[PDB]
């Protein structure tokens, strides 16, 4: 598991790259994957920069914090731009949660430094909404 | 919902006060409420500074990020101090996720400020583990 600020930010950046791709370059494919008629789905970003739409972890509590559940249940109930922004904010939050789960043993100043690396990047919400 | 940095951090601080209380002053009762025989349970901190152990949101995706699910399924399989530290880190991550959910529309400087306010308070993990 990532431990240092640098290891955690490398992991963060790879998962974020995956989620950004799902929400922009691959958006039609991602949208189709989030079928409202499937069971409840989550969007994951993995440290090999792959994204994944799937059921949540079968066994709980999971090893890592979980992404928002059932995003496919919201897809057809709002405009596409609003659904993508909803997925984006929850994904931003998941990225932060995973990073500071790994970073639980960092001291105050190292946690601050980790956030400064994260905060130099546009959020997924920023990108998808065109801020 | 909270929207300014001040409003979001007031909300954070109250939810944190609730979860700190669950993990310290009220820890015996909190531990006993995480009944392994019950369905999957979560620890919530509310903006009126009260804590609650309950089932997750019935309808998904929930309005707010959700706390870690099924912490009662982990209680008897670990030593108490290790279970409490696990709940603590997941609770720290949930507090951060909730605040930056509300803070989706904050700018880069405001996000930095919000994290600096959060980061200056001892984490639940550090309180529980004595770090």
């Amino acid at each position: 598991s990532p431990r240092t600020v640098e290891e955690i930010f490398k992991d963060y950046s790879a998962r974020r790259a995956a989620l950004l791709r799902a929400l922009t370059k691959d958006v039609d494919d991602f949208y189709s994957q989030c079928d409202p008629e499937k069971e409840n789905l989550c969007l994951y970003g993995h440290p090999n920069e792959s994204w994944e739409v799937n059921l949540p972890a079968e066994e709980v509590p999971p090893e890592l914090p979980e992404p928002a559940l059932g995003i496919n249940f919201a897809r057809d109930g709002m405009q596409r731009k609003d659904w993508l922004s909803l997925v984006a904010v929850h994904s931003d939050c998941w990225l932060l949660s995973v990073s500071f789960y790994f970073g639980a043993r960092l001291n105050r100043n190292e946690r601050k430094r980790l956030f400064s690396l994260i905060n130099d990047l546009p959020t997924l919400f920023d990108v998808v909404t065109g801020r | 919902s909270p929207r300014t940095v001040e409003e979001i951090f007031k909300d954070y601080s109250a939810r944190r006060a609730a979860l700190l209380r669950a993990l310290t002053k009220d820890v015996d009762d909190f531990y006993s409420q995480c009944d392994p025989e019950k369905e999957n349970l979560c620890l919530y901190g509310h903006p009126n500074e009260s804590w609650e152990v309950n089932l997750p949101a019935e309808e998904v995706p929930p309005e707010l990020p959700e706390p870690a699910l099924g912490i009662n399924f982990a209680r008897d399989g670990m030593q108490r101090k290790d279970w409490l530290s696990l709940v603590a880190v997941h609770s720290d991550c949930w507090l951060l996720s909730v605040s930056f959910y509300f803070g989706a529309r904050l700018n880069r400087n405001e996000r930095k400020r919000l994290f600096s306010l959060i980061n200056d308070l001892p984490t639940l993990f550090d309180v529980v583990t004595g770090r």
Binding site: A74, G77 | V60
Partner: peptide, 9 residues
């Protein structure tokens, strides 16, 4: 329509 619905069984 709906923003959410019950979690899957």
């Amino acid at each position: 329509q709906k923003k959410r619905r019950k979690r899957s069984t």
